[PDB]
Nucleic acid binder design. Structure first.
Ligand SMILES: [K+]
Ligand SMILES: [K+]
Ligand SMILES: [K+]
Ligand SMILES: [Mg+2]
Ligand SMILES: [Mg+2]
Ligand SMILES: [Mg+2]
Ligand SMILES: [Mg+2]
Ligand SMILES: [Mg+2]
Ligand SMILES: [Mg+2]
Ligand SMILES: [Mg+2]
Ligand SMILES: [Mg+2]
Ligand SMILES: [Mg+2]
Ligand SMILES: [Mg+2]
Ligand SMILES: [Mg+2]
Ligand SMILES: [Mg+2]
Ligand SMILES: [Mg+2]
Ligand SMILES: [Mg+2]
Ligand SMILES: [Mg+2]
Ligand SMILES: [Mg+2]
Ligand SMILES: [Mg+2]
Ligand SMILES: [Mg+2]
Ligand SMILES: [Mg+2]
Ligand SMILES: [Mg+2]
Ligand SMILES: [Mg+2]
Lengths: 50, 153, 107, 63
RNA sequence: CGCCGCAGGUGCAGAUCUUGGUGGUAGUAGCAAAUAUUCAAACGAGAACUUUGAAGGCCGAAGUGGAGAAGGGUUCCAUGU
RNA sequence: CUCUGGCAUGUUGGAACAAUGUAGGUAAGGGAAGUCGGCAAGCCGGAUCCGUAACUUCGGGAUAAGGAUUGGCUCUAAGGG
């Protein structure tokens, strides 16, 4: 909602920063074995815990 | 790459190919069987006529529920349709094959489709929602298409 | 000649008879387009917006029985197109349709 | 090309609905260049954007 | 891997068996609740569906309008694909 | 039904107008003979002026039942500050 506590807003802030694509240079690293961010979350498919 | 049925001599032949194409395999297989053995100019008009619904492709194997048409009598058949998307995809591949023929410097007015093949491509998954909280597959059926055109006159 | 313009009257009532209420006006413009392709032999038929108003003047189901149009066959020598000729059909307001023939109209 | 933004901004500047915003169908390119409310105001002054009048609902029959 | 001994989580068609994959059904059922679309133009490789204009309709203020609470959490806004 | 405001017909379109259906109408003559059963549908319906039974806990029954009128136009009276 519009009325939110600081903890809830701070919690939402962290979930927002970590929902980004992996940097491209990562695949160039030796022994990368990572293709894409498997922890991507869309607001409509899956809802946050809180 | 590995084609099935390599040409009798790969000097008067040109090849074209596509993978994971978003056309129905059953419609494309019937359309490929119709243009097989055609001269390249005949196949191009015929595929354009299918788009304009002036000529049909006969549905011989994958014919369940396919309706009847008057144009199916040109073929020794009763059931026929006008797969527009299959016609476009084969038209694009015929243009690519003719361009390859020009690159090898062999004339395009004598090309004949001696080989054409439609293969199943890996299905892609979507979802549909049913009556009592049930999920059912809504699969796509893409196809791999390859063809070989040779000179004869 | 091939840049000829002619003025016709189309019996919309005849060509719409039997069509359902929500489809009479949309079908009237299809028959008008079909009519133009027949007399002018051009697949590309452009319908003037004023003619589109006249067909839709009395709503979607009470299309006018008769309409007086003007078929202008003109060159498409403006861009690379599969058709070098196109027909522009326009609206000709009339007070009566009695004794109206198909007449050749000058420039 | 696409003028969804311009019709929204013209509606806000003119203080009318998007029903009454008239964008010149011939001068689409100039309107497409307007990405600011200031640019919309200049286009309103220049006549390329017009507030259409209210649809007439007469009371003569009632009177 | 053969031979002499040793030791087993040692042999599958079934168990409405477990997991995975694939068929026929089948280009079938179907994409039918709430009246409705049409003309021209633009961009574009490509237009029934995008945008603009024109027309015909609908919601008809107990709205298909304008704003909030709960809930959602960036869905908001530009540009691009 | 319309104005302000909003939208594009509700996750597709085109062509036809077979059966069967779903939703909605009409039907001569008869009028529940249909059916377990008037189910469903149909009849009635607003307002004004009349007029209203048995029974009753005297409150009701009661819009009982039943009947007449209803448009448009031109006036005429009455009702105030
Ligand atoms: K058919
Ligand atoms: K039919
Ligand atoms: K009965
Ligand atoms: Mg949800
Ligand atoms: Mg069947
Ligand atoms: Mg479902
Ligand atoms: Mg559910
Ligand atoms: Mg065992
Ligand atoms: Mg087994
Ligand atoms: Mg079907
Ligand atoms: Mg359907
Ligand atoms: Mg209405
Ligand atoms: Mg609202
Ligand atoms: Mg947005
Ligand atoms: Mg509808
Ligand atoms: Mg629609
Ligand atoms: Mg919806
Ligand atoms: Mg009867
Ligand atoms: Mg009777
Ligand atoms: Mg009986
Ligand atoms: Mg009986
Ligand atoms: Mg009943
Ligand atoms: Mg009684
Ligand atoms: Mg009277």
């Amino acid at each position: 909602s519009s009325h939110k506590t600081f903890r809830i807003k701070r919690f939402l802030a962290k979930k927002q920063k970590q929902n980004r694509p992996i940097p491209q240079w990562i695949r160039m690293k030796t022994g990368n074995k990572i293709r894409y961010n498997s922890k991507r979350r869309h607001w409509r498919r899956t809802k946050l815990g809180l | 790459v590995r084609y099935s049925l390599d040409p009798e001599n790969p000097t008067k032949s040109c090849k074209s190919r596509g993978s994971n194409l978003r056309v129905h395999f059953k419609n494309t297989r019937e359309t490929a069987q119709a243009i097989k053995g055609m001269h390249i100019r005949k196949a191009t008009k015929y595929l354009k006529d299918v788009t304009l619904q002036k000529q049909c492709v006969p549905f011989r194997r994958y014919n369940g529920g396919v309706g009847r048409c008057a144009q199916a009598k040109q073929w020794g058949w009763t059931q026929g349709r006008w797969p527009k998307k299959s016609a476009e995809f084969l038209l694009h591949m015929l243009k690519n094959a003719e361009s390859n023929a020009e690159l090898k410097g062999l004339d395009v007015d004598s090309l004949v489709i001696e080989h054409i093949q439609v293969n199943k491509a890996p299905k892609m998954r979507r979802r549909t929602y049913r009556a009592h909280g049930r999920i059912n597959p809504y699969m796509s059926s893409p196809c791999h298409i390859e063809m070989i055109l040779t000179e004869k006159e | 000649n091939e840049v000829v313009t002619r003025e016709y009257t189309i019996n919309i009532h005849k060509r719409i008879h039997g069509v359902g209420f929500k489809k009479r006006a949309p079908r009237a413009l299809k028959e008008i387009r079909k009519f133009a392709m027949k007399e002018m032999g051009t697949p590309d038929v452009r319908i003037d917006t004023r003619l589109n108003k006249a067909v839709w003047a009395k709503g979607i189901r009470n299309v006018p029985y008769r309409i007086r149009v003007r078929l202008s066959r003109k060159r498409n020598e403006d861009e690379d197109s599969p058709n070098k000729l196109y027909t522009l059909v326009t609206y000709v307001p009339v007070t009566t349709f009695k004794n109206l023939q198909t007449v050749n109209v000058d420039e | 090309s696409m003028l969804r933004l311009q019709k929204r901004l013209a509606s806000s500047v003119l203080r009318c609905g998007k029903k009454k915003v008239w964008l010149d169908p011939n001068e689409t390119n100039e309107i497409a260049n307007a990405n600011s409310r200031q640019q919309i105001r200049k286009l309103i002054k220049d006549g390329l954007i017009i507030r259409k009048p209210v649809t007439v609902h007469s009371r003569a029959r009632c009177r």
